[PDB]
């Protein structure tokens, strides 16, 4: 029901050179379970031969055959022997194939859902639930396959032996001891997680008194305390040293129940075995075959107290990922957009972000190809929201959006935004060379075309004054350049794309008045036959526009050219006279 | 040379009920080294008795005497046995006496040095070097006393035995094997710290590409990439999976050198021992006394590879604390200040913060007792700096400061600031009840006097509108109250102190004009016969002052009363006419 999705990540589903390593690393697990009943048997045989005064020529070939199987097979769990850690040297290339196919299945999925970040608030906690869900599937798989199943199949082949070859009372002793050694490890461990979660609470409430009694050394000197903060940092460090005594003297109780159980299963077994040797039913060596075989049989059952938490944690830390992969796209688009001329039309579009307010109410216009449209108005009117719906980040509630007589909701969204190039309002940059931030528009462009269209952005003479040339660094999100040099890169990128429809949220905000008409005249021989939608707060830029739209609260109050709204005396003429003086 | 200061923290220097536990926990370390040569010897004896067909009545009292010493003495290091973890149940009360005397020796030392925070920039890194230097002395002491010295004295009593009682070639084999098992653990471990410090560098440079390609999902949709961030997150996750293969297949080389050394010291020893038994120089049981005694002799030498770093780290993480405790106070004061009337005098005081600029130049005035002095001027003139030197946070360069004809540099600074009560400019509060923030002035005051002098601060009718009464919470640094309710607590605290000299940096800054003269008239029946120094930017408060001082750049330009500077027409009269309109 839940391991049915885990075992799909065991078999790598492809690349059959890694379908062979899985069979070898499950064939050195079967060899390892047949060396825990060879070495002990060999040891008893040596003891018997020594007792029967065997010749030296027939005894040196059964001592070097024993030490070789003590090299082959492991020691304890401290010195792990050659068969194990050869299925660790070969298992690296199988858990470096599950930690690459899983976190390229969600990172290629967070970019395709919607304009809702990642169905989370910050991406600092969505990439945390993503890197933690990849280091859980691999870990969980490893524990069950190599640490839990082998351990619980090394006791069952240690009860059918001592059942076959011994006196059938020994098997019962082993079963009773091992079961107790296990139900008094799981019970007392989850009785101790009560004690440390009330310990990590207090120690951060003790250390939050030493900090804020030194964040203001400024104030403790006026009233001359200087000792009263010592007599109440002692009184909160003694309260903490009575709640770690209950978590360091409750681990001693755990290591006196795990010791008294294995100190009685080795008493009621050894004494019985000695008696049998006396009755000549067994011999010497079968007493040494019991003291050796028990000690290698409970030490793998000792690190099952760690694994009861790290497996229980990795089912709530693993299904957090597997419904993150089941989140609906919602905005999914169908033939490609057939772009011919660039005629943009809205027909009565209504839009709302979160249904409380209508952001755009009955927005309608028509842009003929080769014409520049101007959007003006106050802040928060809905100006950049129109340039979000044309690019289709968001679905509209009603109405229709047409480009060359074709609805944008019908065609594919990957072909809609190939003819549209928009410079953002506040521009972000990648954390690399600026010659790659400019070529990111059309990535197949050469170095001769990047430098050519960076002349049209007006930054070309500003980069040659820099050291290191075009491949200097911007830092993260372009913060090492400027406010204005950051922005002229974003105009430059759009020109390398050379889109059919050009959109400009903000282009002159951080630039002075001498640098707009160096670009606006340069964009005018770029926007000669290509559709342009511009919106600016400064009002001298949109004088030579073709049609000016005024937006107050998401509703168009008046439209027309520049001279038709100055003689009208509406809200545009009052906005023009307010800026002239 | 450096363990001479470590062994002083072993002996607790007092409380002789914890000078007895140190002798018991060093007497269960001598019992534990004499159970590693009792249990193996007992085991050989049992084997010999079985061979010689001993009677059952004389064999059951040497098997239950063996299992009892396997309960008493430990198992491996996984199931630690009763003698150990009885010097862990008793050692808690000795390392809870060193983790309380050390971090009350530095926390009572950071409040006594100077007005330089803590000779650091932020207290978030001075309390980090302080809590880390306390969890180092205890840890280091434990490792050497209980983990390193016992281990290296359990091999030397395993060479003088096999030297005495065996055939004098065995001792050499043990010495050769153990030494190699140790110089091929220290060498290969510090050959592997090269490989992981170049692994933690790359993994944070891989994970800083997934974050900033999702901090702006805003920008990657315009140029329609959505796959180009996948084809360069794969190309930087394969660069990382070639630098953890060199750190997970160089640990396999460590566990094939620690295995081949102990797989040859148990070959060249066991074969020789078997030969001796054949020559009837030894017997059966002396072959089992060698296979048992080696395996318990290298497993304590296995966790010496962890302890070579955690001890080397704790000498650079420990002497960072022991010159932090050797930092000079510098400003140390001598009889107590004899306060009679409260006559404050400066005689040509000069002062500089960092020797580049003279902050105060030839400041001189005289305040008769029972009079209010006013300081005015622009921002950054040196107004609050005068109220720092009178309280003596800082030593002056030249000149003299006198209170009632007594220099403040001569008397003790703990008696100087008992007659002076200053409200700070921006007021900070403790993170508890507001009835404790008000009683922190005089801590021995009762609840009837806190509520009485909170009436004089004007907050008394504002707290009874709150829920929970006087013991409501302010949060950390008073941010839960207000800007103005935060400040009226700081006036209130000063009144409970009732000092001889009252200082007011800012008292009306966050209060409106209706709440100053509710306090200023209320302070006027508090400041009736007690010296007051006030400084305010609003100029209506200091009209009825006794003497007004004007400070431009740390130099007094003009002084006198209110009417004597309006008729003078100086810089005070131009500052008065600028505020009237």
Numbering used by the authors:
A (entry chain B), B (entry chain A): 244 to 576, 580 to 827
Which sentences from the paper describe this structure?
ABCB6 is an 842-amino acid protein that belongs to the B subfamily of the ABC transporter. ABCB6 is a “half-transporter” that contains a single pair of TMD and NBD, but needs to form a homodimer to be functional. ABCB6 plays a crucial role in energy-dependent porphyrin transport, drug resistance, toxic metal resistance, porphyrin biosynthesis, protection against stress, and encoding a blood group system Langereis antigen.
The TMD contains six transmembrane helices, among which TM4 and TM5 insert into the other hABCB6 monomer in the homodimeric transporter. The TMD region of hABCB6 contains a loop “plug”, just like a gate, which includes a sequence of “GGGTGSTG” in the middle region of TMD. The “plug” intervening TM2a and TM2b from one monomer interacts with TM5 and TM6 from another monomer of hABCB6, indicating that the “plug” is important for maintaining apo-form conformation and may undergo conformational changes during the transport process.
